[PDB]
């Protein structure tokens with residue numbers, strides 16, 4: 098089983114995104130989860146976000162039903178500025194502002210999640226958090242697949258996945274994966290549209306050389322809902338004791354949101370001899386996104402709208418059932434070039450087998466932003482009373498808004514040019530002294546940035562030089578158990594400027610982790626467990642003397658326990674489950690402190706199992722079901738209020754189409770939120786809450802020719 102290819106069973110024993118070298122999970126000093134393509138082919142996830150609903154240490158409701166971005170919170174932390182922190186084939190998909198890219202899960206072979214500091218091999222990064230997806234590569238045997246989806250809210254999807262060789266030797270092979278998806282968003286008025294295709298070409302001149310061309314082109318006319326809803330009407334009852342239905346939409350009838358993505362690159366490797374292997378991963382991308390968006394701020398009585406006139410012009414008791422709103426017109430375009438070159442030296446030193454990795458990583462990202470942001474009273478208010486029982490028979494779109502002619506009073510232009518560059522040199526060794534595998538290594542990064550404000554004519558720049566290393570040990574037993582512990586570090590530059598008109602210094606990550614991994618060589622089952630102590634130092638916090646500007650020195654701690662399990666308990670039984678304990682807390686902070694950051698539940702857990710029949714008349718029938726538990730979380734930094742826990746159930750019914758001459762093909766039915774439970778996924782503040790996803794039914798027919 099290769100770290101860059103299929104896994105056979107839902108259990109992947111190999112992963113290269115933790116050490117940059119194909120290594121069995123048990124031999125990796127860090128918490129690494131691997132969602133197989135098979136698993137994704139089980140719930141037909143809408144996004145890579147979803148494909149992670151069962152993996153521990155990851156929240157996936159930081160936006161509820163919305164799918165605009167695969168923005169994740171890992172171990173209580175996320176990248177600064179609501180930015181993603183997602184990697185594709187070992188090279189980061191560096192985005193900026195509203196320009197973050199997403200890859201459709203159908204084009205993936207596997208989605209992996211690295212928990213904890215990751216700079217020792219990838220450079221600047223949020224603490225305890227990294228996602229790396231592996232593009233599908235040409236297959237060893239021919240593959241001709243056609244897929245058809247049909248579901249709730251007018252879900253219609255058609256896609257293909259073909260892979261064959263040009264020559265009988267396989268020196269030349271290709272793979273073309275594409276799809277077209279259209280659907281109505283949960284919220285009335287909003288649509289979801291996606292067209293994508295991934296051309297891939299592999300050239301193996303011999304059994305020691307592999308150059309694989311990887312491209313992805315995707316166009317999304319409409320990405321759907323991305324607004325905020327007040328805790329008043331969702332988490333908490335509105336004055337009239339009623340609530341906004343889960344399909345409510347407080348955006349302009351003419352709200353639009355699109356994104357365009359284009360990337361070309363390659364993954365290369367060559368084995369020179371018995372001790373040296375070289376591998377280079379390169380990708381270049383140009384992505385765009387534009388939008389006309391009216392989003393909700395909170396209700397007119399929300400501290401946020403204190404300085405709002407339209408609000409102050411309402412009877413003191415009515416300020417609590419009227420919704421304040423703002424808007425934003427955006428248009429961005431960025432280019433991202435990335436290349437990682439690495440030499441793998443394999444040699445010994447008397448019983449000490451070494452696996453030395455030495456390489457340099459480079460990336461440059463440029464993102465030009467030209468947008469307009471409406472401030473207070475920038476857009477009409479909305480009454481929240483009408484949303485009663487007759488809605489709940491629901492939706493009811495609203496009215497257009499003049500995104501054009503931006504009043505210089507209520508709105509202002511925002512035009513910035515962000516540049517980013519990072520160069521890293523890392524050295525790592527994987528020395529195994531029989532049953533005693535010791536991993537250790539470090540990296541030095543040159544993190545340079547520069548931002549131009551096309552209006553203030555300002556140009557902020559900062560060049561960070563940072564070092565990070567990681568050390569760990571794995572006692573590879575033989576019965577399978579692989580106890581381990583490791584120390585890791587990460588660093589994350591700031592783009593914010595202090596009162597002294599200067600970019601702040603980077604924040605850092607320090608994690609202490611110990612755990613045990615069970616990867617028994619016989620049965621196809623993997624069971625990991627770990628407890629950790631992660632620390633983010635020099636976080637930004639409110640200036641002690643309140644000055645609009647922020648001050649550094651802040652600190653946050655996140656300690657918890659994570660256990661996950663995936664297995665093939667039978668030729669017909671599969672199971673996946675995990676539990677997560679997350680204790681995140683502001684160690685040092687001006688305003689908050691002792692408070693837990695919003696959107697990070699203390700408890701999370703999931704369990705899923707499927708059975709398949711080969712027996713009687715029910716031969717070729719798979720039935721599966723599972724549940725995901727999200728504990729309560731805080732809906733704001735002040736911890737003013739709380740978002741209640743919830744549990745959602747998923748079900749699956751699959752039927753092998755062999756009994757009609759079509760072996761390998763099948764028809765399936767997937768249900769998400771079986772009991773159509775209504776829940777607020779989370780809130781990042783009193784005015785920003787997100788309804789969870791309502792029950793969704795999808796019918797899939799996937800044929801293999």
Ligand SMILES: N[C@H]1[C@@H](OP(=O)(O)O)O[C@H](CO[C@H]2O[C@H](CO[C@]3(C(=O)O)C[C@@H](O[C@]4(C(=O)O)C[C@@H](O)[C@@H](O)[C@@H]([C@H](O)CO)O4)[C@@H](O[C@H]4O[C@H]([C@@H](O)CO)[C@@H](O)[C@H](O[C@@H]5O[C@H]([C@H](O)CO)[C@@H](OP(=O)(O)O)[C@H](O[C@H]6O[C@H](CO[C@H]7O[C@H](CO)[C@H](O)[C@H](O)[C@H]7O)[C@@H](O)[C@H](O[C@H]7O[C@H](CO)[C@H](O)[C@H](O)[C@H]7O)[C@H]6O)[C@@H]5O)[C@@H]4O)[C@@H]([C@H](O)CO)O3)[C@@H](OP(=O)(O)O)[C@H](O)[C@H]2N)[C@@H](O)[C@@H]1O
Nearest residue numbers: 382383430431432461463464465466467514516518549551
């Ligand atoms: N490494 C890497 C990096 O480097 P670094 O340094 O960074 O590190 O990077 C790089 C880059 O590349 C990339 O990019 C691209 C794009 O780019 C662009 C384009 O578009 O192209 C450009 C840019 O800029 C620049 C740079 O580079 O930066 C600079 C300048 O100066 C120049 O040089 C340019 C070119 O070369 C030329 O063209 O480049 C940018 O842009 C923007 O910004 C800028 C600044 O700020 C920067 O800093 C400014 O300047 C500009 O401008 C403006 O524009 C506008 C438009 O429209 C757009 O929007 C306009 O306005 P209006 O009002 O008009 O509308 C304008 O424009 C126009 O005009 C002009 C002028 O005109 C006049 O004058 C002149 C004289 O002086 C002329 O000549 C005449 O006479 C008159 O008329 C012009 O110039 C323009 O253009 C033109 O050009 C040519 C000539 O030469 C021709 O003609 C053509 O046809 C045309 O076009 C016009 O248009 C104004 O001006 C702006 O604002 C960018 C942005 O940022 C975005 O991104 O852009 C890319 O491509 P694409 O396509 O894809 O995009 C690529 O890919 C990449 N790579 C690199 O190279 C390296 O490698």
Ligand code: NI
Nearest residue numbers: 461463516518
């Ligand atoms: Ni340059």
